[PDB]
Scaffold this active site. Structure first.
Site, PDB file in Angstrom:
ATOM      1  N   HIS A   5       0.810  -1.250  -0.027  1.00 11.11           N
ATOM      2  CA  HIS A   5       0.047   0.201   0.082  1.00 11.11           C
ATOM      3  C   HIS A   5       0.788   1.073  -0.318  1.00 11.11           C
ATOM      4  O   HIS A   5       2.041   1.203   0.102  1.00 11.11           O
ATOM      5  CB  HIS A   5      -0.843  -0.095   1.178  1.00 11.11           C
ATOM      6  CG  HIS A   5      -0.156  -0.333   2.436  1.00 11.11           C
ATOM      7  ND1 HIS A   5       0.886   0.646   2.985  1.00 11.11           N
ATOM      8  CD2 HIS A   5      -0.271  -1.449   3.296  1.00 11.11           C
ATOM      9  CE1 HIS A   5       1.145  -0.090   4.365  1.00 11.11           C
ATOM     10  NE2 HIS A   5       0.729  -1.044   4.383  1.00 11.11           N
TER      11      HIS A   5
HETATM   12  C1  LIG Z   1      -0.790  -0.517  11.208  1.00 10.91           C
HETATM   13  C2  LIG Z   1      -1.889  -0.815  12.180  1.00 10.91           C
HETATM   14  C3  LIG Z   1      -2.586  -2.101  12.236  1.00 10.91           C
HETATM   15  N1  LIG Z   1      -3.513  -2.213  12.924  1.00 10.91           N
HETATM   16  C4  LIG Z   1      -4.355  -3.283  12.687  1.00 10.91           C
HETATM   17  C5  LIG Z   1      -5.579  -3.163  11.571  1.00 10.91           C
HETATM   18  C6  LIG Z   1      -5.068  -3.434  10.162  1.00 10.91           C
HETATM   19  O1  LIG Z   1      -5.824  -3.807   9.125  1.00 10.91           O
HETATM   20  C7  LIG Z   1      -4.155  -4.895  10.597  1.00 10.91           C
HETATM   21  C8  LIG Z   1      -3.012  -4.828   9.738  1.00 10.91           C
HETATM   22  O2  LIG Z   1      -3.320  -5.420   8.308  1.00 10.91           O
HETATM   23  P1  LIG Z   1      -3.103  -5.293   6.804  1.00 10.91           P
HETATM   24  O3  LIG Z   1      -3.016  -3.564   6.793  1.00 10.91           O
HETATM   25  O4  LIG Z   1      -4.201  -5.814   6.263  1.00 10.91           O
HETATM   26  O5  LIG Z   1      -2.043  -5.978   6.514  1.00 10.91           O
HETATM   27  P2  LIG Z   1      -0.890  -5.720   5.505  1.00 10.91           P
HETATM   28  O6  LIG Z   1      -0.429  -4.394   5.608  1.00 10.91           O
HETATM   29  O7  LIG Z   1       0.548  -6.509   5.810  1.00 10.91           O
HETATM   30  O8  LIG Z   1      -1.395  -5.915   4.019  1.00 10.91           O
HETATM   31  O9  LIG Z   1      -3.753  -4.485  11.638  1.00 10.91           O
HETATM   32  C9  LIG Z   1      -3.879  -1.395  13.811  1.00 10.91           C
HETATM   33  O10 LIG Z   1      -4.765  -1.739  14.551  1.00 10.91           O
HETATM   34  N2  LIG Z   1      -3.159  -0.432  14.122  1.00 10.91           N
HETATM   35  C10 LIG Z   1      -1.934   0.029  13.263  1.00 10.91           C
HETATM   36  O11 LIG Z   1      -1.202   0.950  13.757  1.00 10.91           O
END
Ligand SMILES: Cc1cn([C@H]2C[C@H](O)[C@@H](COP(=O)(O)OP(=O)(O)O)O2)c(=O)[nH]c1=O
Ligand SMILES: CC(C)(COP(=O)(O)OP(=O)(O)OC[C@H]1O[C@@H](n2cnc3c(N)ncnc32)[C@H](O)[C@@H]1OP(=O)(O)O)[C@@H](O)C(=O)NCCC(=O)NCCS
Ligand SMILES: CC(C)(COP(=O)(O)OP(=O)(O)OC[C@H]1O[C@@H](n2cnc3c(N)ncnc32)[C@H](O)[C@@H]1OP(=O)(O)O)[C@@H](O)C(=O)NCCC(=O)NCCS
Ligand SMILES: CC(C)(COP(=O)(O)OP(=O)(O)OC[C@H]1O[C@@H](n2cnc3c(N)ncnc32)[C@H](O)[C@@H]1OP(=O)(O)O)[C@@H](O)C(=O)NCCC(=O)NCCS
Ligand SMILES: CC(C)(COP(=O)(O)OP(=O)(O)OC[C@H]1O[C@@H](n2cnc3c(N)ncnc32)[C@H](O)[C@@H]1OP(=O)(O)O)[C@@H](O)C(=O)NCCC(=O)NCCS
Ligand SMILES: CC(C)(COP(=O)(O)OP(=O)(O)OC[C@H]1O[C@@H](n2cnc3c(N)ncnc32)[C@H](O)[C@@H]1OP(=O)(O)O)[C@@H](O)C(=O)NCCC(=O)NCCS
Ligand SMILES: CC(C)(COP(=O)(O)OP(=O)(O)OC[C@H]1O[C@@H](n2cnc3c(N)ncnc32)[C@H](O)[C@@H]1OP(=O)(O)O)[C@@H](O)C(=O)NCCC(=O)NCCS
Ligand SMILES: Cc1c[nH]c(=O)[nH]c1=O
Ligand SMILES: [Mg+2]
Ligand SMILES: [Mg+2]
Ligand SMILES: [Mg+2]
Lengths: 294, 283, 286, 290, 285, 285
Positions: free
Chosen positions: F202
Site C-alpha cells: 500500500h
Molecule cells: C498498522 C496498524 C494496524 N492495525 C491493525 C488493523 C490492520 O488492518 C491490521 C494490519 O493489516 P493489513 O494492513 O491488512 O496487513 P498488510 O499491511 O501486511 O497488508 O492490523 C492497527 O490496529 N493499528 C495499526 O497501527
C-alpha cells in the site's frame, strides 16, 4: 581431655571427647562421647553433638545446629542460621554424613544419613541420604557406593536391563517391545516425565506393590536403583534401552537432558498410599520382607 | 620468633621464621627459614615446608602436605587428606585443595577456587571446579608475523569470498616453512579440556583451526604467549623445542595440524622443567 | 569487654564493643562503638571499622579494608589485599551483609545494604541493594523486590507505569501497536536498542534528571529494576506487547538478558552525558 | 514421409524423416535423416535439427534452437528464446534427453548425454552426463554413476578410497594420515573450500599433472570422479574418510552441506594452465594417452 | 461424434463419446462410452480408456496407459513410458507430469503442475515438484471426543505442569479403551515419508506423539479425517478395521503406539479397495 | 488473416489479428486488434482478448478468462476453470509452460516465470516463480555504507545508525528530526511472519514511515509510481524512510524477523491506498 589452651564453659561433654587448643565452647552445648573437637573451632549454646563426631579445625557450630552420631565435619566447614543477616536485628546433619572441606551449609538445611557433601560445595538445599553433592550451588552428582545384549541382570535385586528390537531404514526407525515377553508385566498405566530442569532430582521413592518399566524416549537421563543394600546407576539414552524396577526397589531419576522424555509403564493405577519416601523406613521394610521370604 | 601465644611443639624450624599467636604446630613438622606463619593456623606432623613460605591465617596444613620454597598460601586456604605445592606457586584466599594434588611451579590458584586435579606450571586456575583460564605472563593482520616466543610465526592466508563459496590456500615451503609428512585433526574436544602440554625434539608443527576456535599457548622456556585460532585463514608455526598447549576448544572446533615427521612417541618432552633445562642448554 | 584471651594492641576501640577469644587486633586499628568481634578473627593496622558492626569468627580484616556502620560480616568471610600475590582498598559500605565463607577480591566496593550470598566469590564491585551469589558472583536480585495483565497499571515505584499493548495475531503474522502521548506518555526524541548483552551483565545503573524513558523488550527477555529511592521492584520484559514507563528520577537497571534479547528504549530528549545520575547515594538524597 | 495433415514448408528435411499430423514446419528449418517429428509440434525458421532426433508431440522448436544428433525430446517439452518477453540461442547436444513437460530457459546449453528429468525448469547450462531435476532444476547425479578398509580401489582408474586411523575418547577425537604411506604423494599445497551453498556445483575439470587428495573435515559433500569411461559418486561425510584423485581424473564436488569444509592436499603449486575444463577434450586426451 | 478435423483410426469407441478437432487416435485404441476427448489430443495403440472419461486438450495418452471410468484429465497433463493406471474417479490437474509405471489411486486429486514420481494412494491430494501428499479428499479439548470416523476417539490426558518439570498420565481401560500387549515407537522419519497406509483386522491401536509432531489420517471406509498430534497429552484411538496414515512427521517427532495384540504380519490389510469392501460387508449385519 | 488450416467460428476478431494453423476458436469469443494467435492453440466462448496480445502455441483459453491489452502469453501456458474468472491485466507476461489456477488476477506488467504454478493473485509488477509460485522480485527493481544516502525512489533515504560494540554488549541509537527526519506519533512492530507472506502493498496519503528490522532479516520494496527498488534490512543499524505517497512492500521475512516501524500519524484506515493503479494516478497530481 580439655586442653588448657581451650575455653570450655560447658559441663555436658561425654567421656573420651577431646577438645584441642583455641576451641571455644559455650555453656549450653551438649557434646556426646568419643568426639574430637580440633583446634580453633567454636560451638555455641543451642547445640547438640552426638557420639563419635569428628569436627576438624576452623569450623563453627552455631545455635540451632544438631549433629547426629558418626558425622565427619571437614576443616573450615562453615554453617549459618540466618538466611537474611543484618547487624543487630535449625540445621541437622544426620548420622554418618560426611561434610567436605570448606563447604558452606545454608540455614535450616537437612543433610541425610551417609551423604557426602564435597569439598567447597555451597549447600542450598536438603541433601537426601547417600547423595553426593558438589559445586556452587551444590548439585547431586552421584550416590555413595553406586548393556548391548537382549537381557542382562543388574547387581540390584531383580532389576533387569533390556535391549529392544530396533530397525533402521530409509523410511525411518522403529523399536518395539512386547508386554510379558520383553517387559515382565502388563501395565495398567503409563506416564511421561519431561521439561525437567537439569538440576532437579525426580523420584526418591519405592513402591510397595507397583512394578515399573522405564524408557528414555528422547535425550537422556540417569536412573538410580537401590535394593536397601546394593545400589547402581544407569544412563538411559536411547529409545531401545529400558530398565525394570520390581516393587520395593528405591528409584531416583536425575540428570535429565533438556530434551529428555522419560516413559514409564506401571503395573497398577495411581495410588498415593503405595509410596515409601523415607529411605530408612524403606531400608527396614525391605529387611522384613527379605527375612520373611528366606 | 615463636609467640608466647603460639603452641609450637616442633624443634625443626629454621632461622627467622616467625610463628604468630594461636598457631598450633605439632612435633614432626619440619619448616625452613624466613617463613611467616600467621595467626590462627595449624601444621600437623608430616609436613615439610621450604624457605620464604607465607602461610596466612586460617590455614590448616595436614599430614602429607609438602610446600616448597617461595610459596604463598593466602588467607583461609583449605587443604585435605600426598599434596605438593611447588616452588613459587601462590594459592588464592579461601581456595580448597583436594587430596593427592600437585600444584606446579609458579602456578596461580585464584581466590575461592576448588582445585580437583593437578595444576600445571604457570597455569592460572579459577572456579568451582577450577579450570585453567590462562597462563602467567602470557594479531594475524599480516602475511607473516614473528612472535616474541622464539621462532614462532603467525600467518594470514589468501582468502577468497564469492557467491559460489569460500577458499583459502597455503603453500608448503613457502607460506608454511616446511614440507609435511603427516597431518592430524583434533575435534570433539570438551571445553574444559587442556590438550598438548608438551614440546617436540625434532618435529616442526603447523596449526590451523578449520572451524570453531581454540586457543594456543606457545612457550620457549622464558616467554609464552596465548593466541586465538578462530578462522581457517589463520595459522601458527611451532618450531621444534616450542612447548605448546591447546585448550578452550569450542564444541565444533577442528584443529588441523601438519607435521614435519611421522609419528614417533619418543619425540615428545612432557615435563616442563626438563624442557626448560634443555633450552637453557642449547642457547 | 576485651576478653582476656584476645590479644589487642589497638588503643582506638570504641565503647561497648566486645572482642572475644583468640582475636588479634594490631595497634593501628580503629574500631567504633557497639561492635562485636567474635572468636578467632583478626584485624590489622590500616583498618577503619565503624559502629554497630558484627564480625563473626574466622574472618581477617587486612590492611586497606574499611568497613562502615551497621555491616554484618558472616562467619569465615575472607578478604584479600593484593591481586597477584607472591596496597589496594576495600570498603564494605553501610548496612551491607557479607554471607558466610564468601571471598572478597582486592579493591572491591560493596554497596550500602547489599546482600552477598554465602559462599560467593566477589570479583567486581557490588551495587547498593544488590544480592550477589555464585562463583564467580553474579547479581541475582535486589533487596526488597503475574501482571502486565491490564492495559495500564501503576507501580509502587513513583510514577512508574506498566503497559499492555494491542496485539493482533493471525496466519499472516503478528502485529503490536503503541501510540505516543496516548499509550506512551511522552513524544520521543530518540530511540536506542540494546542487544547482544552477555547473561552475566548488568546495564543501566542510573537515573535521569530530565529524560523520560519507555522500555520494550522486543525479542527474548530481560529484567528491569526500577527504584524511586524508597521502593523498588523487578519486572520481566519477555514479550513485545509489554512496556514500562520510567519517569525522570527513576533509578533503572536492566539485567538477566537472554542471548537473543533486544531492548528498545524510547527517550524524551537527545543524548546528554550530563543528564545521568550514576551515584546511588547522590541519587537517594534528591 | 510428410503427413497430408501436416503443414511443412521446408524443402530441407533429410531422408526417412517422418512428420506426423498437425505439425507446422516453416520454410527456413533444416532437419536431418531418420527423425520422428510427432503430431502437434511446431518448428520455426532458424532451426537446425540433426539426425535420428525424436521430437514427441506438443513441442515447439523456436528460432535460435539447435538440436544435435540422437537427441530425444519428450512430449510437451517447452523451449524459449526471449528472457523477459513483452508483447539468444539454445543448443541441445548429442545424445541428451529432455524429459516430458520440462521447460528450458533461453540461451541454454544442454550437454551431451545429459538427462533433464520430466517437469524440470532448467535455468542454467546442463553439463555432459548430468541428471537434472526440480524447479529450479538441480544436478542430482550423473548418468551411469563404502570406506570400510584402510585401502580400496575404485572402478575409476587410479582412484583410491581411504579410511584413516581414528581415536575416540573422553579427552576428544584424533585422526592421522601420513604422506607417501596413506596418501600416495607429498603435497606442496593445501586449500580449503567452505560456505558452499547447497545448489553449487564446484570442480568440473581435471588436472594434467596435479594429484589431489580430498577429505571432508566438517559436514558432508559429494565427489564425482570420472576417467573418461567410468564415473562414480562418493559421499565424504567424516574426517577419517579420504579420496585420491590421480592426474587426468575429471572431478566434481557438489551437494555440500552448510557446515561442510573440504580439505584438499595438492602435489603441485597452483597453476591455472593445468586445468582441462571441457569434458569432450578431456575424454579424447584420456584416450590418446591409453 | 468424430469431428471432420480429427484423424481417428479406431472403431472401438463407445457411444456418445465426442472426439474433437486435431486429435490423433491410433487403431489399437479402446475408448469406453460417453467420453469427451478435446481438441489437440493424441491416443496411441495400447490404451484402454473406460467410460465417462474427460480428456482435455494438449494431452497424449501413450502406449501402456490405462484410464478407468470417471477420470478427469486436465489440460496439458503429460504421461510417459512400463504401465500407468489412473483409477476410477481420479482427477489429474492441469499441466501435471506423470512419470512412467505409476498408479494413481481412486478418487485421488493430482494438483495442477504437480510432478508425480511415486504411486498416489486412493483419495490423496498430491501437489508440488516432486509431488507430495499434503491432504486427503474430504478430510482435542475435552477428556474424550468422538470422531465422525466410526469408533475413533480423541483423548486429552491429565497434565501437570510445575517447578520440577512436567507430567502427563494415562491409564489403560479408563482413558485408553484396552490393555496393550505391545508398544512400538517410530522416530527419525523424513518429512516427506508416508507411514502406515493399512488397517488391522483385529489389532487395536493407540497413538500419542511424544515429541515433535505428526499428522494422522483415520478413515473408516466412508468417512475420513486428519488430526495433528503435537503434544504428549493428546492421544488417538484406532479401533480395529480403521485405515490409518501417519505423515508430515517433524524432524524431532517420536510416535508412541500401544497395540492390543502381538505383532502379526497377517493382520494387515494393505489395499484400500479391499479394505473398503470388507468394511461395507460388516455394515451389512 | 485466418489460416485455412484453423477452425474459427467467432465473427468477432479485430483488424490485423492473425490466427494460424490448427487453432480452434469458438463462436462467442471476442479478440481485439493486432493479436497473434499461434498454431495449436484453443479459445473458448466466453473469452475476451484485447489488442496486441500474443498467444504463443500450446495454450488454451477457457471460458471465464479475460486477457487485456499488450499481454504476452508464452508457449504451453495452461489456464484452468475449476479447483471462476481469470483476468490477466495489461502488459503482463506469462512465461512458457506456466500453470494458472482458476479465479486468479495477474497484475499489470507482472512477469510470471517459465514453469511457475500460480496459485494466488500476482500484484502489479511482481515477478513470480517456482512451484508454488512465490514473488521473488519486482520488474526493474553496497547499500547502507554511508550514514545517509538517497534512493532513485523519490525521497527515499537509507540510514546507517550509530553502532557501539564492546564486551558488555551492543547499542545502536538514532534521533528524531536529525537522523530520522520526522517525529513519531505511533510505533508498531511486525513479527512471526511466514517466509512466503508479502506484507504491506500500500501507500499512505499522509503518514511518513521509518523502518528498522531489529532482529532477523526482511526485504522492503519502495515504489514512487515510476521507479522502484528493493533493499534488505538485515541489522538493527539499517533504516529506510518512506515519505508519504510511497508504495511499500515487505516480504522475504526470516523466521526470527521483527520489523519496527515509526509512523508520523496515529493509525487511520482511510489514509491507505491499496490499489496500485489508483496510487499511480493520484501520483500524477
Ligand atoms: C498498522 C496498524 C494496524 N492495525 C491493525 C488493523 C490492520 O488492518 C491490521 C494490519 O493489516 P493489513 O494492513 O491488512 O496487513 P498488510 O499491511 O501486511 O497488508 O492490523 C492497527 O490496529 N493499528 C495499526 O497501527
Ligand atoms: C566429592 C568427592 C568425593 C568426589 O570425588 P570423585 O567422585 O573421586 O571425583 P573425581 O576426582 O573422579 O572427579 C570427577 C569430576 O568431579 C569434579 N569434582 C570432584 N570433586 C569436586 C568438588 N569437591 N567440587 C567440585 N567438583 C568436583 C572433578 O573436577 C571432575 O569433573 P570435571 O571432569 O568436569 O572437571 C571428592 O572429590 C571430595 O570432594 N572429597 C572430600 C575431600 C575432603 O573434604 N576431605 C577431608 C580430609 S582432611
Ligand atoms: C585469579 C586472578 C589472578 C585473576 O585475575 P585477573 O586476570 O585480573 O582477572 P580479572 O580480574 O580481569 O577478571 C577476569 C574474569 O575472571 C573472573 N575471575 C577473576 N578471579 C576469579 C576467581 N578467583 N574466581 C572466579 N572468577 C574469577 C572475573 O569475574 C572475570 O570473569 P567474568 O567477566 O565472567 O565475571 C585473581 O583474580 C585472583 O583470584 N587472585 C588471588 C588474590 C588473592 O587470593 N590474594 C591473597 C592476598 S591477601
Ligand atoms: C543469598 C540469599 C539471601 C538468597 O536466599 P533466597 O532468596 O531465599 O534464595 P533461595 O533459597 O530461594 O534460592 C534461590 C536460588 O538461588 C540459589 N542460591 C541461594 N543462595 C545461594 C548461594 N549462597 N550460592 C549459590 N546459590 C544460591 C538456590 O540454589 C536457588 O537456585 P537453584 O534453584 O538453581 O538451585 C541466601 O541464600 C543467603 O545466601 N544468605 C546469607 C546466609 C548467611 O551467609 N548467613 C551468615 C550469618 S548466620
Ligand atoms: C530423472 C529420472 C531419470 C530419475 O529416475 P530415477 O533415477 O529412477 O529416480 P528415482 O525414481 O529413484 O527417484 C529418487 C528421487 O528423485 C525424485 N525425482 C525423480 N524424478 C523426478 C523428477 N522428474 N522431478 C522431480 N523429482 C524427481 C524422486 O521423487 C525421489 O526423491 P524423493 O525420495 O525426495 O521423493 C526420471 O525420474 C525421469 O524423470 N525420467 C524422464 C522420463 C520422461 O520424461 N520420458 C519421456 C518418454 S515417454
Ligand atoms: C490441489 C488443489 C485441490 C488444492 O486446492 P485447495 O485445497 O483449494 O488449496 P488452497 O487454494 O487453499 O492453497 C493452499 C496451499 O497449497 C498451495 N497449492 C494449491 N494448489 C497447488 C498446486 N497445484 N501446486 C502447488 N501448490 C498448490 C497454495 O499455494 C497454498 O500453500 P501456501 O499457503 O504455501 O502457498 C488445487 O489447488 C488444484 O491444484 N486444483 C486443480 C485445478 C485444475 O487443474 N483444474 C482443471 C480444470 S480446467
Ligand atoms: C523469471 C525470469 C524473468 C527471471 O530472470 P532473471 O532475473 O534473469 O533470473 P536469473 O536467471 O538471473 O536467475 C536467478 C535465480 O532464479 C532462478 N530462476 C530463474 N528463473 C526461474 C524460473 N522460471 N523458475 C524457477 N527458478 C528460476 C535461477 O535458477 C536462479 O536461482 P538459483 O541461483 O537458486 O538457481 C526468467 O528467468 C523467466 O522465467 N522468463 C520467462 C521466459 C519465457 O517463458 N519466455 C517465453 C517467451 S520465448
Ligand atoms: C587433632 C589435633 C591433634 N593434636 C593437636 O594438638 N590439635 C588438634 O587439633
Ligand atoms: Mg573458608
Ligand atoms: Mg505442450
Ligand atoms: Mg506443459
Amino acid at each position: 581431655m580439655i586442653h588448657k589452651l581451650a575455653d570450655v564453659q560447658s559441663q555436658n561433654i561425654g567421656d573420651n571427647t577431646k577438645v584441642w587448643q583455641f576451641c571455644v565452647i559455650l555453656a549450653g552445648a551438649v557434646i556426646g562421647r568419643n568426639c574430637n573437637i580440633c583446634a580453633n573451632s567454636l560451638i555455641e549454646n543451642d547445640v547438640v553433638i552426638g557420639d563419635n563426631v569428628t569436627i576438624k579445625s576452623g569450623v563453627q557450630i552455631w545455635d540451632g545446629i544438631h549433629i547426629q552420631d558418626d558425622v565427619f565435619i571437614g576443616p573450615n566447614v562453615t554453617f549459618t542460621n540466618d538466611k537474611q543477616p543484618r547487624s543487630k536485628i535449625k540445621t541437622i546433619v544426620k548420622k554418618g554424613a560426611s561434610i567436605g572441606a570448606n563447604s558452606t551449609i545454608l540455614p535450616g538445611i537437612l543433610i541425610g544419613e551417609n551423604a557426602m557433601v564435597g569439598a567447597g560445595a555451597v549447600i542450598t538445599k536438603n541433601v537426601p541420604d547417600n547423595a553426593i553433592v558438589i559445586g556452587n550451588p551444590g548439585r547431586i552428582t552421584g550416590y555413595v557406593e553406586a548393556f548391548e545384549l537382549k537381557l542382562q541382570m543388574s547387581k540390584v535385586k531383580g532389576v533387569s536391563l533390556h535391549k529392544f528390537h530396533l530397525v533402521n531404514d530409509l523410511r525411518g526407525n522403529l523399536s518395539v517391545g512386547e508386554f510379558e515377553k520383553d517387559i515382565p508385566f502388563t501395565p495398567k498405566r503409563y506416564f511421561t516425565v519431561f521439561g525437567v530442569p537439569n538440576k532437579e532430582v525426580r523420584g526418591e521413592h519405592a513402591h510397595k506393590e507397583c512394578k515399573q518399566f522405564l524408557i528414555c524416549v528422547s535425550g537422556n537421563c540417569s536412573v538410580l536403583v537401590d535394593d536397601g543394600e546394593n545400589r547402581e546407576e544407569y544412563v538411559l539414552d536411547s529409545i531401545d534401552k529400558g530398565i525394570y524396577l520390581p516393587p520395593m526397589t528405591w528409584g531416583v531419576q536425575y540428570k535429565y537432558s533438556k530434551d529428555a522424555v522419560l516413559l514409564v509403564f506401571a503395573s497398577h493405577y495411581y495410588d498415593s498410599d503405595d509410596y515409601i519416601r523415607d529411605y530408612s523406613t524403606f531400608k527396614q521394610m525391605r529387611q522384613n520382607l527379605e527375612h520373611h521370604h528366606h
